[PDB]
Scaffold this motif. Structure first.
Motif, PDB file in Angstrom:
ATOM      1  N   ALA A 117      57.074  32.925  43.410  1.00  0.00           N
ATOM      2  CA  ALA A 117      57.944  33.742  42.592  1.00  0.00           C
ATOM      3  C   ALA A 117      59.387  33.321  42.807  1.00  0.00           C
ATOM      4  CB  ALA A 117      57.744  35.230  42.895  1.00  0.00           C
ATOM      5  N   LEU A 118      60.220  33.669  41.828  1.00  0.00           N
ATOM      6  CA  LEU A 118      61.668  33.562  41.930  1.00  0.00           C
ATOM      7  C   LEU A 118      62.211  34.922  41.609  1.00  0.00           C
ATOM      8  CD1 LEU A 118      64.329  31.957  42.137  1.00  0.00           C
ATOM      9  CD2 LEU A 118      64.125  31.505  39.684  1.00  0.00           C
ATOM     10  N   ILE A 119      63.036  35.452  42.529  1.00  0.00           N
ATOM     11  CA  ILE A 119      63.647  36.755  42.327  1.00  0.00           C
ATOM     12  C   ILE A 119      65.148  36.651  42.477  1.00  0.00           C
ATOM     13  CG2 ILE A 119      61.526  37.880  42.969  1.00  0.00           C
ATOM     14  CD1 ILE A 119      63.096  38.730  45.562  1.00  0.00           C
ATOM     15  N   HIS A 120      65.815  37.588  41.818  1.00  0.00           N
ATOM     16  CA  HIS A 120      67.231  37.858  42.008  1.00  0.00           C
ATOM     17  C   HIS A 120      67.361  39.216  42.672  1.00  0.00           C
ATOM     18  CE1 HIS A 120      70.919  39.929  40.750  1.00  0.00           C
ATOM     19  NE2 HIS A 120      71.503  38.750  40.894  1.00  0.00           N
ATOM     20  N   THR A 121      68.230  39.356  43.695  1.00  0.00           N
ATOM     21  CA  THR A 121      68.543  40.678  44.267  1.00  0.00           C
ATOM     22  C   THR A 121      70.056  40.880  44.459  1.00  0.00           C
ATOM     23  OG1 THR A 121      68.044  42.366  46.040  1.00  0.00           O
ATOM     24  CG2 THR A 121      67.968  40.048  46.696  1.00  0.00           C
ATOM     25  N   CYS A 122      70.513  42.053  44.091  1.00  0.00           N
ATOM     26  CA  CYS A 122      71.887  42.473  44.312  1.00  0.00           C
ATOM     27  C   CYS A 122      71.868  43.642  45.267  1.00  0.00           C
ATOM     28  CB  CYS A 122      72.559  42.857  43.001  1.00  0.00           C
ATOM     29  SG  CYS A 122      74.241  43.423  43.295  1.00  0.00           S
ATOM     30  N   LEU A 123      72.373  43.441  46.474  1.00  0.00           N
ATOM     31  CA  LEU A 123      72.439  44.480  47.498  1.00  0.00           C
ATOM     32  C   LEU A 123      73.769  45.261  47.446  1.00  0.00           C
ATOM     33  CD1 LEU A 123      71.315  45.866  50.044  1.00  0.00           C
ATOM     34  CD2 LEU A 123      72.237  43.920  51.330  1.00  0.00           C
ATOM     35  N   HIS A 124      73.661  46.584  47.497  1.00  0.00           N
ATOM     36  CA  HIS A 124      74.793  47.494  47.639  1.00  0.00           C
ATOM     37  C   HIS A 124      74.553  48.265  48.936  1.00  0.00           C
ATOM     38  CE1 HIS A 124      75.919  46.999  43.315  1.00  0.00           C
ATOM     39  NE2 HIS A 124      74.624  46.769  43.214  1.00  0.00           N
ATOM     40  N   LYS A 125      75.505  48.199  49.843  1.00  0.00           N
ATOM     41  CA  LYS A 125      75.344  48.846  51.109  1.00  0.00           C
ATOM     42  C   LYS A 125      76.691  49.336  51.552  1.00  0.00           C
ATOM     43  CE  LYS A 125      73.736  48.124  55.806  1.00  0.00           C
ATOM     44  NZ  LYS A 125      73.089  47.150  56.727  1.00  0.00           N
ATOM     45  N   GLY A 126      76.910  50.639  51.371  1.00  0.00           N
ATOM     46  CA  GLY A 126      78.171  51.284  51.739  1.00  0.00           C
ATOM     47  C   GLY A 126      79.319  50.599  51.039  1.00  0.00           C
ATOM     48  N   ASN A 127      80.369  50.301  51.795  1.00  0.00           N
ATOM     49  CA  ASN A 127      81.563  49.708  51.209  1.00  0.00           C
ATOM     50  C   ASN A 127      81.622  48.194  51.444  1.00  0.00           C
ATOM     51  OD1 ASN A 127      82.452  49.286  53.805  1.00  0.00           O
ATOM     52  ND2 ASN A 127      83.600  51.235  53.868  1.00  0.00           N
ATOM     53  N   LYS A 128      80.481  47.586  51.784  1.00  0.00           N
ATOM     54  CA  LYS A 128      80.385  46.126  51.872  1.00  0.00           C
ATOM     55  C   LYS A 128      80.512  45.519  50.475  1.00  0.00           C
ATOM     56  CE  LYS A 128      77.201  46.165  55.824  1.00  0.00           C
ATOM     57  NZ  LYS A 128      77.675  45.169  56.828  1.00  0.00           N
ATOM     58  N   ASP A 129      81.038  44.295  50.413  1.00  0.00           N
ATOM     59  CA  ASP A 129      81.104  43.530  49.166  1.00  0.00           C
ATOM     60  C   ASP A 129      80.162  42.337  49.250  1.00  0.00           C
ATOM     61  OD1 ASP A 129      82.233  42.728  46.513  1.00  0.00           O
ATOM     62  OD2 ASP A 129      83.018  41.040  47.673  1.00  0.00           O
ATOM     63  N   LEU A 130      79.074  42.429  48.506  1.00  0.00           N
ATOM     64  CA  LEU A 130      77.952  41.504  48.616  1.00  0.00           C
ATOM     65  C   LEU A 130      77.738  40.858  47.265  1.00  0.00           C
ATOM     66  CD1 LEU A 130      75.859  44.017  50.629  1.00  0.00           C
ATOM     67  CD2 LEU A 130      76.674  41.825  51.470  1.00  0.00           C
ATOM     68  N   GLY A 131      77.209  39.640  47.270  1.00  0.00           N
ATOM     69  CA  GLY A 131      76.988  38.922  46.029  1.00  0.00           C
ATOM     70  C   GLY A 131      75.523  38.735  45.721  1.00  0.00           C
ATOM     71  N   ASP A 132      75.283  38.102  44.586  1.00  0.00           N
ATOM     72  CA  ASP A 132      73.943  37.839  44.107  1.00  0.00           C
ATOM     73  C   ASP A 132      73.182  36.967  45.093  1.00  0.00           C
ATOM     74  OD1 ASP A 132      76.057  37.660  41.806  1.00  0.00           O
ATOM     75  OD2 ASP A 132      74.255  38.511  40.899  1.00  0.00           O
ATOM     76  N   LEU A 133      71.889  37.228  45.262  1.00  0.00           N
ATOM     77  CA  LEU A 133      71.072  36.452  46.186  1.00  0.00           C
ATOM     78  C   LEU A 133      69.714  36.171  45.522  1.00  0.00           C
ATOM     79  CD1 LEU A 133      70.493  35.360  49.075  1.00  0.00           C
ATOM     80  CD2 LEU A 133      69.655  37.648  49.594  1.00  0.00           C
ATOM     81  N   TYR A 134      69.431  34.888  45.252  1.00  0.00           N
ATOM     82  CA  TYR A 134      68.166  34.481  44.668  1.00  0.00           C
ATOM     83  C   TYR A 134      67.263  34.050  45.787  1.00  0.00           C
ATOM     84  CZ  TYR A 134      70.757  34.046  40.287  1.00  0.00           C
ATOM     85  OH  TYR A 134      71.515  34.214  39.173  1.00  0.00           O
TER      86      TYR A 134
END
Ligand SMILES: [N]
Length: 184
Positions: A117-134
């Motif tokens: 499989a190929l997935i995309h995930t966008c994590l939101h965790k509190g006030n962290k600034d996180l980017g796209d992760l495939y």
């Protein structure tokens, strides 16, 4: 921040993907590449448990030994696209950090077959600034990425050569714990 609206696989087969089995991350691509380590181990299990769509996660930094598990009951945005409000748990499902608003990831299955499989995930965790992760996933933790999934990487207008492999980290996984976390 995340920047991609990943497109789900045409004809995504949810029952096959969410069959309760384990998926290993074999390769990953973080669009903000200092956001995650250059060496890592992750895996997940995906399934329906007592009627609820669930995912269990495992992360392990092979250098620092930082370990954590998570479980979520996934909400559906559209076929192949989910929002997951996660709780951090120990391997047995005991809650370490409860579900909270603003702790969630999104999850889009861009390509899947029975083995890969190929997935995309966008994590939101509190006030962290996180980017796209495939992530490229496989049912076999040692599998090199095949043509089906590599073609999907290209079709997403990504370069597989940029993905970081997890294969050289001596990753060992507790498959039993991921499967049983689906019920927790
Ligand atoms: N992540």
């Amino acid at each position: 921040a995340c920047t991609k609206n990943a497109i789900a696989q045409t004809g995504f087969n949810k029952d096959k993907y969410f069959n309760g089995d384990v998926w290993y991350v074999t390769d990953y691509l973080d669009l903000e590449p200092d956001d995650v380590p250059k060496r890592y181990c992750a895996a997940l299990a995906a399934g329906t448990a007592s009627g609820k769509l669930k995912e269990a996660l495992y992360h392990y930094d092979p250098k620092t030994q930082d370990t954590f598990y998570d479980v979520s009951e996934l909400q559906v945005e559209s076929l192949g696209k989910y929002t997951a409000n996660f709780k951090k748990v120990d391997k047995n499902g005991n809650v370490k950090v409860a579900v909270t608003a603003g702790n969630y990831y999104t999850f889009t299955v861009m390509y899947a077959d029975d083995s890969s499989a190929l997935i995309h995930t966008c994590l939101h965790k509190g006030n962290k600034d996180l980017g796209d992760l495939y992530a490229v996933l496989n049912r076999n933790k040692d599998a090199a990425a095949g043509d089906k999934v590599k073609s999907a990487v290209s079709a997403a207008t990504l370069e597989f050569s940029k993905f970081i492999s997890t294969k050289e980290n001596n990753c060992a996984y507790d498959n039993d714990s991921l499967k049983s976390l689906l019920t927790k």
